[PDB]
């Protein structure tokens, strides 16, 4: 249960950009400073940037 | 290399 301190912009087709607030279930957080995270309100799937979330 | 943080 982390909190995207701020909206991500997807760089890649990887990653899932996400908003300011909006919840993202981290799932491996060892791959370095990327992480898996699964969008709980649409259901898809995409890493994100640790700068820009927080773990709450 | 994360992105330039707000």
């Known amino acids: 249960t982390f909190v995207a301190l701020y909206d991500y912009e997807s ?8 908003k300011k607030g909006e919840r993202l279930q981290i799932v491996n957080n060892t791959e370095g400073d990327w992480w898996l995270a699964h ?3 649409t259901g898809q799937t995409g890493y994100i940037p640790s700068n820009y979330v927080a773990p709450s | 290399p994360l992105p330039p943080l707000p």
Request: no cysteine; charged share 25%.
């Open chain 1, 39 to 41: 969008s709980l309100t």
């Open chain 1, 11 to 18: 760089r890649t087709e990887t990653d899932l950009s996400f």
